[PDB]
């Protein structure tokens, strides 16, 4: 009953993969929600064709800006902002799916997957999904990031939806 969405990864527009991710609507319903139907383009809107703004190997891979594109943008499905839902779920590994912010409830549609366990992130940040399939194309993302964070190539969602 949880639902599940998947990303079409291309890379310069070379389908690289698949990941799908597990969302924890039992947990989290409305910041789930938001992820879902962004993931659809139910709303009108959403993360498709937006690209990966930025990876750091061995922390976390961010996107989720399809407004501005250039990482300061994005928006929820409730308005421009919405509350940080609970802190119930940490970061407790690779492929923890997490909402980025800017500070206290100022969740937009930017997200992040852990590539690893980033316990100094909980409590900052709400966990809200997990990569279910795909880890090893989000391993691949990695190569193409960088530890300042820019990437190398165009890492982008070419196709995203509801399984
Ligand atoms: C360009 O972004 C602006 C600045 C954050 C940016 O300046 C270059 C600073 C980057 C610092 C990078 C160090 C690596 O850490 C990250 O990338 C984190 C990891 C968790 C998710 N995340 N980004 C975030 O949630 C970050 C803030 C952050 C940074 C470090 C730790 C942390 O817990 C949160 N927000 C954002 O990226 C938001 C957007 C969601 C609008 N951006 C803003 O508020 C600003 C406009």
Redesign the pocket.
Known sequence: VNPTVFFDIAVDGEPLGRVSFELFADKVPKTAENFRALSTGEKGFGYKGSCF??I?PG??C?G??FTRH?????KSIYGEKFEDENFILKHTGPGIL??????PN?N?????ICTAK?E??DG??VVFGKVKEGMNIVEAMERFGSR??KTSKKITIADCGQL
């Not at 250039?70 to 994005?74: F, V």
């Not at 997490?98 to 500070?103: D, I, K, Q, V």
């Not at 937009?108 to 992040?112: A, D």
Request: proline share 0%; glycine share 22%; hydrophobic share 30%.
């Open positions: 703004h930025r750091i922390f976390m961010q989720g800006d250039n990482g300061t943008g994005g997490s909402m980025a912010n800017a500070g100022t937009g549609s930017q997200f992040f980033t100094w992130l900052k940040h300042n964070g």
